[PDB]
Amino acid sequence: PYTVVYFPVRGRCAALRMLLADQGQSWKEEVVTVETWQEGSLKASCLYGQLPKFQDGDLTLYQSNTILRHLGRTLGLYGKDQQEAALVDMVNDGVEDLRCKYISLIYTNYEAGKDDYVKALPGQLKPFETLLSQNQGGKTFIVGDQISFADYNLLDLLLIHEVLAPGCLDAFPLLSAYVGRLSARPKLKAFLASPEYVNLPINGNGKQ
Amino acid sequence: PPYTVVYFPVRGRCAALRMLLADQGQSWKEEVVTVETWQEGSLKASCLYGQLPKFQDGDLTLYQSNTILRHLGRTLGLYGKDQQEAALVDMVNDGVEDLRCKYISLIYTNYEAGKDDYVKALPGQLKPFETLLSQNQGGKTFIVGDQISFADYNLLDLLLIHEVLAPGCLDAFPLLSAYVGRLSARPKLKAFLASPEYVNLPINGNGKQ
Numbered sequence: 001p002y003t004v005v006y007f008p009v010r011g012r013c014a015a016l017r018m019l020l021a022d023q024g025q026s027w028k029e030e031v032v033t034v035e036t037w038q039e040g041s042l043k044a045s046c047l048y049g050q051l052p053k054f055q056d057g058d059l060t061l062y063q064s065n066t067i068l069r070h071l072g073r074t075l076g077l078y079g080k081d082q083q084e085a086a087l088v089d090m091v092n093d094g095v096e097d098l099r100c101k102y103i104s105l106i107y108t109n110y111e112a113g114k115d116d117y118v119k120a121l122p123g124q125l126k127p128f129e130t131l132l133s134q135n136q137g138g139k140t141f142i143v144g145d146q147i148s149f150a151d152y153n154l155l156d157l158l159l160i161h162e163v164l165a166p167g168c169l170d171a172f173p174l175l176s177a178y179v180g181r182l183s184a185r186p187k188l189k190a191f192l193a194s195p196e197y198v199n200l201p202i203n204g205n206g207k208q
Numbered sequence: 209p210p211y212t213v214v215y216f217p218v219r220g221r222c223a224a225l226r227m228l229l230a231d232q233g234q235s236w237k238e239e240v241v242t243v244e245t246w247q248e249g250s251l252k253a254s255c256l257y258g259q260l261p262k263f264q265d266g267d268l269t270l271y272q273s274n275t276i277l278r279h280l281g282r283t284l285g286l287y288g289k290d291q292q293e294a295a296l297v298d299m300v301n302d303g304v305e306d307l308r309c310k311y312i313s314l315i316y317t318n319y320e321a322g323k324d325d326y327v328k329a330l331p332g333q334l335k336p337f338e339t340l341l342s343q344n345q346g347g348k349t350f351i352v353g354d355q356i357s358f359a360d361y362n363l364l365d366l367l368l369i370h371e372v373l374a375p376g377c378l379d380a381f382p383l384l385s386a387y388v389g390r391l392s393a394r395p396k397l398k399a400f401l402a403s404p405e406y407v408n409l410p411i412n413g414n415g416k417q
């Protein structure tokens with residue numbers, strides 16, 4: 001039914017994989033090594049010359065957030081109504097903004113930039129704590145009282161930041177509890193513990 | 209009006225959503241924030257991610273330019289005819305966003321030193337949208353399907369600002385060129401694009417374009 005085409009890294013597929021696993025969906029992983037990519041043929045066929053590429057039957061998609069939104073739309077993980085859908089997008093766009101900064105650090109400026117990045121991190125995380133505080137005291141999900149694709153993306157963002165800056169959630173009780181709660185969902189817990197996840201590096205350059 | 213746009217006195221990340229509203233004949237209010245007012249700090253501190261645009265739809269307050277686009281897309285029926293088309297609309301918009309981020313980085317962080325390399329790389333960055341047009345009714349309608357979507361307005365803005373940056377950049381892309389001409393000629397949009405409301409704002413906030 002579903003196929004994920006990507007490099008052997010967590011990266012921009014981590015959240016959509018968590019979503020699929022937690023939702024009890026089956027999918028095929030099509031692994032593309034850097035050597036295979038460097039040949040050029042698959043890259044030339046990709047819409048924006050990049051991975052992930054995703055297949056849902058005869059539908060082929062590119063763009064990690066398009067894949068998330070598609071799964072959210074088709075699986076009912078996109079809020080209860082239009083108002084919640086907009087809030088879901090607002091969270092996801094915020095997650096994407098911080099992910100872009102994280103990626104820039106990892107791949108272009110790790111040694112020289114890490115200190116300033118970590119110093120700035122609390123101010124980058126506080127909006128998500130605020131979002132939780134304004135939704136049922138943070139006891140459920142990031143938007144409303146059902147899970148959305150933005151929860152999986154935010155969860156991944158938080159997990160990778162815990163590796164980059166251990167203790168970065170200690171000042172944020174709602175985010176800390178939210179990470180624990182979501183990570184304990186049975187199917188997700190099983191996936192996060194699986195070698196499929198654990199034995200992939202977070203990024204492609206050995207930095208985290 | 210039920211809609212309010214809160215932004216700096218520039219086109220920037222509100223240009224597409226304004227084009228959308230104008231072309232759809234929807235009324236809205238502009239609340240202008242000067243750099244002076246912004247530097248005071250109170251509005252900024254109240255913004256979810258410390259940034260503008262801020263958007264109000266009745267008592268619904270939104271941040272994030274693409275969130276605003278998607279919201280208006282949903283509520284005004286500019287988000288495809290079915291679930292498959294909606295995904296394709298997202299795929300276009302995400303591509304537009306990726307290039308817009310590169311454009312913004314050039315404008316604000318590296319204009320003089322980076323422009324030549326950027327313009328050299330531009331055809332490769334525009335080609336995917338030409339490809340999308342070529343695979344949809346010979347490029348004679350919209351970017352996805354046979355009705356306009358929020359992605360059309362965002363793509364259109366992206367193309368317009370790149371024509372200012374790199375005049376003639378669409379000479380290599382007949383479908384994109386015709387597409388810009390066609391959408392820009394839509395009566396309400398044409399009127400808006402010619403109006404002081406649009407013309408008298410700079411594209412960006414630093415005087416570069």
Ligand SMILES: N[C@@H](CCC(=O)N[C@@H](CS)C(=O)NCC(=O)O)C(=O)O
Pocket residue numbers: 011012043049050051052062063064065302306
């Ligand atoms: N906006 C894209 C970015 C994807 C991207 O940056 N792809 C990287 C891997 S995560 C890639 O394919 N790099 C190989 C290349 O550019 O040649 C998304 O969200 O999917």
Ligand SMILES: N[C@@H](CCC(=O)N[C@@H](CS)C(=O)NCC(=O)O)C(=O)O
Pocket residue numbers: 093097220221252258259260261271272273274
């Ligand atoms: N991801 C945001 C980016 C918004 C953004 O970069 N805002 C700029 C203006 S376009 C800003 O508010 N800068 C002022 C500041 O950061 O203090 C969006 O798409 O709305």
Ligand SMILES: O=[N+]([O-])c1ccc(SCCCCCCO)c2nonc12
Pocket residue numbers: 007009011012034037038103107203204205
């Ligand atoms: O999000 N990324 O920028 C990103 C994700 C995953 C990877 S894994 C390896 C991909 C292949 C290398 C790039 C093409 O020679 C990245 N390598 O460089 N940037 C990467």
Ligand SMILES: O=[N+]([O-])c1ccc(SCCCCCCO)c2nonc12
Pocket residue numbers: 216218220221243246247312316412413414
């Ligand atoms: O998309 N942008 O990076 C962007 C948009 C609009 C503007 S307009 C002026 C905003 C005020 C900047 C704050 C100065 O203390 C930008 N100025 O710097 N980056 C800007």
